[PDB]
Design a protein around this ligand. Structure first.
Ligand SMILES: O[C@H](c1cc(C(F)(F)F)nc2c(C(F)(F)F)cccc12)[C@@H]1CCCCN1
Ligand SMILES: [Zn+2]
Ligand SMILES: [Zn+2]
Lengths: 86, 50, 249, 112
RNA sequence: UAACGAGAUUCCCACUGUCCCUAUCUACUAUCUAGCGAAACCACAGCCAAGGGAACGGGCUUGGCAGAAUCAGCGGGGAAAG
RNA sequence: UGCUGUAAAGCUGGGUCGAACGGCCUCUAGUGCAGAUCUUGGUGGUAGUAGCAAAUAUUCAAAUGAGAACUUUGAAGACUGAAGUGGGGAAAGGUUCCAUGUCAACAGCAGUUGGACAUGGGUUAGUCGAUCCUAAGAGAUGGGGAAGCUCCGUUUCAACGUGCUUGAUUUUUCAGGCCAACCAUCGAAAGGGAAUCCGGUUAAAAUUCCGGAACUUGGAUAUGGAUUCUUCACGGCAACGUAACUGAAUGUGGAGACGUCGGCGUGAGCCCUGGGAGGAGUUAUCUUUUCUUCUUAACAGCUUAUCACCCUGGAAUUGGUUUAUCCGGAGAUGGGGUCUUAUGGCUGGAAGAGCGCGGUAAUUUUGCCGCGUCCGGUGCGCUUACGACGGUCCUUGAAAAUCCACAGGAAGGAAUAGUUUUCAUGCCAAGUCGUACUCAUAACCGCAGCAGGUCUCCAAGGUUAACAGCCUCUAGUUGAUAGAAUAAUGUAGAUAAGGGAAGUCGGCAAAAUAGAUCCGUAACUUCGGGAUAAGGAUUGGCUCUAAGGAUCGGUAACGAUCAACUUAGAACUGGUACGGACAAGGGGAAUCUGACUGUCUAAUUAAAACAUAGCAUUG
RNA sequence: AAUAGGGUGAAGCCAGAGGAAACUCUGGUGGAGGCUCGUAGCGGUUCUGACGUGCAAAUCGAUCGUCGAAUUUGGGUAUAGG
RNA sequence: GCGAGAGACCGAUAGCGAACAAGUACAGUGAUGGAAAGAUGAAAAGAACUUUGAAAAGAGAGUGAAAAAGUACGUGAAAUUG
RNA sequence: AAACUUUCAACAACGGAUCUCUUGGUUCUCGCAUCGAUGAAGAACGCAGCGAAAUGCGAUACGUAAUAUGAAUUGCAGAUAUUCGUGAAUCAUCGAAUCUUUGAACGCACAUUGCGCCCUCUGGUAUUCCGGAGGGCAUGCCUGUUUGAGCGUCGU
């Protein structure tokens, strides 16, 4: 009754893909993501889930801009172009 | 279903292209460690969760 | 224990009223210049059934005194009101069934319905089928009128409060037995989720103060103090007396 | 006998998913989807169906000439003939009685 | 308390393998073969009688005895398994 | 291979192996395993054992191949039996679709086969959906709470328009005229809603492509027609008609827009059937025979209706009238008309299409020619749509976008010319996303190719009350490891002398009854029931008889023609059979208990428990 | 959005008979009901049947309750751990 | 976080979960949960060719210091097995 | 006596222990201060002559410019590629750029590749309609500008 026969009536997704994190944690009826908290301004994160922070944090993606801030700082945040040596 | 969203159809397009065997000229490269594509997926066995 | 059904009704999740089919709120006109100083005339267009109400409602069309417009009002139909009847409302309106008059303009003994508790609230008293308000007397010095409510209580209202002359239509509804659970189901299907009722003595001690025991019994007096708290007020609240009512009160 | 299928994705016998069974020039039997039946224009006074006015689905009234949607009379496509007749007589008699009540009133506004 | 009841109970008619008291028949197994091929469980293991013993032994003591490898059944024991 | 030590252990011979390691004096510790139902990994006995047994069932030959119970083709035998094992979809899956190749692993036997493996191919829209609307509801803003994450509120204590409409101006400035109750937004691939059909075509797509024929919306815009000198049309007593035939602000209405059941009527598709023109089958005998083709889309015109309405007239001797008794001096019957066009007919679309035959071309891309495609009938038939009615409720059975009409009379209009795109014709455009396939005893969820679960459309012949059961046509499958035997014990199913519950806690299980027609039917009762009470008789086949109707023709009470299955009776007849398979109540006399219909412990309790109407009390 | 085919035969209506009246009786018609037999459906009584390392972590077979409403059901939506 | 230097630290069941396409594969509606997996050889020199086989393979041969290193790859213990 | 069972040895299996490594981990110390509306962290989808992943990048897409260096890349192929040279390869360096759809995410909306409006240019006989290109339109708050509102209020 409550096992195999009832498990056959599962064809209505409670969650769909999230637009912020793309993870399929976006609750359809609540219009909220259970993973990242979208559409709230802040990202959902808790100190009681330290392993969850590992999965989605700085360094787990591309860091396409923070990659180069260290290299730009070491040169004093240069403006201009390089001069060819004589 | 036949009636699907663009976002759904776009995820299913990527899933087809990642579902291909290893090109064999890759096994001849120097210091190569990949023997086969380890991320294969069959439709009946593992679901996409899309 | 657990939160009892008494306390679950206040949150109002599944206990709100089913209002899809209702035909509008039944109210008198807003008290305006015409009603305060003279009278305005309207015509009854419809007499319709309002789901959840025993009294039929009347749709009465009035003219807007200030702009070229028609105003549709939802009145509670008094018995004898018909479609095409002219309804006159105001201080100078005449004493005819269906007319809306201030209480001071009605002689003693006048049977009036949909009476205003306060001047301009558009009707509070005697709105259910077969019910009405009797005018007991007037106090012109204090500008007050004494009325008798359907419960038998006497109330003092401003003589400027309005009411509709006659008895609310649809009376005698209670005289027929429902005869069926299905009839009560259909009765409450367009009112609210309050039926059927499980007896509290038939529950477990979590569910109700009356639950539990190796026989079904209340165990303590079912008359509960007025100063008791929510979750305790199950039974006869602040009962002045109990038992079969014998004689006059 | 040949059996038919719906021609659209709706598989349910709803009010807008009604079909007829039609034989085609190919000697076939296909389903033909039937639109919802039109309702008659009715009088604003008595509620009866107005004569002389085409029965169309509301957007289709835009696509027909004016003679199909009206009758050459006052309140032509709005009220029926009998309800217009009562308006004329009531307006005439009541306004006539308004004059008598005025002349009568002026008789009591100058002697008592 | 009429009507109703997959509610509990007693009696009567009809009916019958429920029984006296069992017999016979059919299909699928079981059985044998080709292919395929698990699991529970397992201190070591596996014949009895008495004795004593943690007071009901497969093992100890004293007797009876004791001959390869096995197949189908079976449900006494393993104070069987869970 | 041995030696040393009581021992923990140390050293050594031989084999294997390939890059580091030891003795002694000290330091240091994550330092010694047989157990912890220890942890992780690996391997046994059991054991070639249990088993691979639901869904009726397969067989012969040929081809392919190294290999065939299982692949392909042919022949046969079967099943699902239109409430399908058929043909589609919604959810869900995501390439499972199609072609070619292919068999290491998977398909609990096999495999040359596959939803497996590999390489490629494949989804075409102004008209089908989404998109738009609002539903229950969700939720910004102004504000008000809260330390705050945030909560409340959505007509709300707000100075809330990214307003429109014109004459314009080309001066990219303007002049004004009206309004702003309500109005952020999201919320339906089953509600509402602009518009497409037929024939053909692919290996796989088609209401999407090709051919033809249409339609809607938005824009531009000319010609014809129409109108005006009585400026913004005529006709009809009227209902109202038409090719058109000004109309601002504002207002009023209508459509969108609505439960359920009952019988009736009409149509459509299907079923049934006659003639004729073809084709196929049977032919020992018979059969003017059995089977089969003979079709007509969206769209345009004319015509077509119950209801409703108009004119005439004035009604008791009351008449008209439905299967169902409702209407009429508030105007019936009669006579004459108007309207809706649901539905049918004719014509165009359109025979040029499709279908069925016959004759020819050819490896042949692909064909070419000829003929026919016609005229009816029937009905308590089945399904479905609509219509006019009737019943029912202490139940009266959404909203909005959107479209139209009317009221109003602002403004602008002619004569040598003026207006209008609601009349006809013509020109341009319609973007975005989905579109393959499964929808299930193998494409979804149950760990799986699981006897479970999962919403819906179409529905042939016979028997019959029946869409039940049984047989068959179209379509689809023949899938489920197999072979040989037929012990015990089983599982599922049968029968049984005489007795008939003696068995057992207990008639548990089985048996008996069963359809229909006719007869007969008790106590008790809330008068409705009990009741199919109980208890009896009949039932096949064949040959007849009688009754029950329609349309025409003027004691027409008659003739002519046509037509559906219902009922009743009689004779004969037979191994006394006959609802012959299927289908299908056992009954009676009482007690306890709950009034009844209904509900719950998904997965051990369905009850006397819960609920209920009714009664009463309390605020 | 879905729900074969029968039985029974409530109001209302038509006709006839009896009666002084108040009224009564008979034959039709009609098609009511949380009525009834019984399919699909929904449920799950009994065999305390099968299976019980199953087809299945609740199924299979027969038997059975109910089957036009307090009915069954898709989707949307609301209610969230004292 | 960025950049460096170290250690009486661990040495692939240890040390971070991760020495490897590791927060990967995979599970769950979701929050979350979360592995296994290093080593041929100095160098592919990764076995040409003949022969049996439908093929996988086998037997010769060949490369290599070694095939007692053949990718099911250094050494190759025990259970278990011929 | 065979077979069978058990024990032992040799060889071969099963399996992956032991030994030896180690671009990894862990801990300690030293030095530094550098994310984002000038659009970050993160996500999705794409990009190579032949790529699935990892790594890199964004329609200029395993990268463009610049500076330095000085002859490669490499599994195969190939220059309309290069060698006493503005010249191979190079995240060597890096100061100039590109940066799809998003995301605090900003026209509104978003389970939709949904729906607007403004300016300039352009095509279709167009101030109004349809198509294309480029540039714009969020909220709170601050300073200032302009236009306003209120018998709150001063003057004539
Ligand atoms: O004061 C009495 C009264 C009664 C009632 C009644 F209850 F019947 F509706 N209505 C009255 C009315 C009335 F409202 F008009 F009905 C007015 C004045 C007196 C009335 C008496 C009764 C007898 C006649 C005079 N009025
Ligand atoms: Zn998210
Ligand atoms: Zn009218």
């Amino acid at each position: 009754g409550k096992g195999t026969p009832s498990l056959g009536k599962r064809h209505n997704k409670s969650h769909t893909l999230c637009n912020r994190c793309g993870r399929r944690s976006f609750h359809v009826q609540k219009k909220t993501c259970s993973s990242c908290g979208y559409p709230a301004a802040k990202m959902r994160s808790h100190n009681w889930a330290l392993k969850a922070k590992r999965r989605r944090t700085t360094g787990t993606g591309r860091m396409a801009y923070l990659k180069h801030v260290t290299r730009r700082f070491k040169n004093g945040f240069q403006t201009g172009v390089a001069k060819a040596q004589t | 279903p036949s009636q699907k969203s663009f976002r759904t159809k776009q995820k299913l397009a990527k899933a087809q292209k990642q579902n291909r065997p290893l090109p064999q000229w890759i096994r001849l490269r120097t210091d190569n460690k990949i023997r086969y594509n380890a991320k294969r997926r069959h439709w009946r066995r593992t679901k996409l969760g899309i | 224990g657990r939160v009892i059904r008494n306390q679950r009704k206040g949150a109002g999740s599944i206990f709100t009223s089913h209002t899809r089919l209702r035909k509008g709120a039944a109210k008198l006109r807003t008290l305006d210049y015409a009603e305060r100083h003279g009278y305005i005339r309207g015509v009854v267009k419809q007499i319709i059934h309002d789901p959840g109400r025993g009294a039929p409602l009347a749709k009465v069309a009035f003219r807007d005194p200030y702009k070229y417009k028609l105003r549709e009002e939802t009145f509670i139909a008094n018995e004898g009101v018909y479609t095409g009847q002219f309804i006159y409302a105001g201080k100078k309106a005449s004493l005819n069934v269906g007319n809306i008059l201030p209480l001071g303009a009605c002689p003693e003994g006048t049977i009036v319905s949909n009476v205003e508790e306060k001047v301009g609230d558009r009707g509070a008293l005697g709105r259910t089928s077969g019910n009405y308000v009797i005018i007991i007397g007037h106090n012109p010095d204090e500008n007050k009128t004494r009325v008798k409510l359907p419960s038998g209580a006497k109330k003092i209202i401003s003589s400027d409060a309005r009411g509709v002359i006659g008895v609310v239509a649809g009376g005698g509804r209670i005289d027929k037995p429902l005869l069926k659970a299905g009839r009560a189901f259909h009765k409450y299907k367009v009112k609210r989720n309050s039926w059927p009722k499980t007896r509290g003595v038939a529950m477990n001690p979590v569910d109700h103060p009356h639950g539990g025991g190796n026989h079904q019994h209340i165990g303590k007096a079912s008359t509960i103090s007025r100063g008791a708290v929510s979750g305790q007020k199950a039974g006869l609240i602040a009962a002045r007396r109990t038992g079969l009512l014998r004689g006059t009160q | 006998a040949q059996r038919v299928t719906y021609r659209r994705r709706n598989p349910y016998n709803t009010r807008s998913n009604k079909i007829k069974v039609v034989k085609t020039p190919g000697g076939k039997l296909v389903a033909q989807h039937v639109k919802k039946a039109a309702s008659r224009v009715k009088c604003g006074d008595c509620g009866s169906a107005l004569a002389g006015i085409s029965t169309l689905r509301p957007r289709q009234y835009a696509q027909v000439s004016k003679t199909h949607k009206t009758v050459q009379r006052a309140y032509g496509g709005s009220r029926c003939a009998n309800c217009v007749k009562e308006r004329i007589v009531r307006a005439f008699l009541i306004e006539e009685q308004k004059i008598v009540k005025r002349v009568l009133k002026e008789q009591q506004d100058k002697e008592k």
